[PDB]
């Protein structure tokens, strides 16, 4: 109470909340991957991608993540999906300056 | 100052200070109230 401001007043509720936190976390993660199972993702923020499209200066960490993800997938497809036999050439692969 | 990222260094430095002071205070209150001060030892992992 003097360090954090709040404290537990019950061993039973303390132990039950200790039980409660990981079961709730794992169940919500299960619901999230269930949502992912049908290609229903939290991939694109529509308004942010719109303002990034009509604003060449509007750089954000979210847009950096989005671009890194299509880079991930462009490098995934060829060597991770043999049954697609995607013979993507070197030039079509997106990459930055130097490196 | 905002353009070159000075508020970042300010916030990170003060957060370092505040976290170290917070866990040393956990040591202190465990000393004062009659405990074993390994609470600060346990917090040395989130500090780490």
């Amino acid at each position: 109470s003097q360090i954090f401001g709040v404290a537990f007043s019950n061993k039973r509720w303390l132990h039950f909340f200790m039980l409660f936190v990981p079961v709730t976390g794992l169940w919500m993660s299960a619901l999230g991957v269930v949502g992912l199972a049908l290609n229903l993702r939290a991939y694109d923020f529509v308004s942010q991608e719109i303002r990034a499209a009509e604003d060449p200066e509007f750089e954000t960490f979210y847009t950096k993540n989005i671009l890194l993800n299509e880079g991930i997938r462009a490098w995934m497809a060829a060597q991770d999906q043999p049954h697609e036999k995607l013979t993507l050439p070197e030039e079509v692969l997106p990459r930055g300056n130097a490196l | 100052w905002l353009y070159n990222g000075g508020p970042y260094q300010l916030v990170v430095c003060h957060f370092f200070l505040g976290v170290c002071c917070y866990m040393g205070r956990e040591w202190e209150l465990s000393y004062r109230l009659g405990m074993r001060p390994w609470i600060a030892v346990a917090y040395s992992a989130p500090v780490a």
Partner: protein, 48 residues
């Protein structure tokens, strides 16, 4: 210090590469490497 680096570490008697999940992670690492800070690289090797 880097983690494990087992890229092309598995090869056969003919010397042909046995691509592993480590090599999958390697090419994934290339995918997230080529354009992290996609304008600040003026050299091939990233020693900064």
């Amino acid at each position: 210090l880097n983690g494990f680096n087992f890229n092309q570490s598995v090869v056969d008697s003919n010397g042909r590469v046995l691509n592993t999940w480590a090599d999958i992670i390697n090419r994934a690492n290339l995918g997230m490497e080529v354009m992290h800070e996609r304008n600040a690289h003026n050299f091939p090797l990233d020693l900064a």
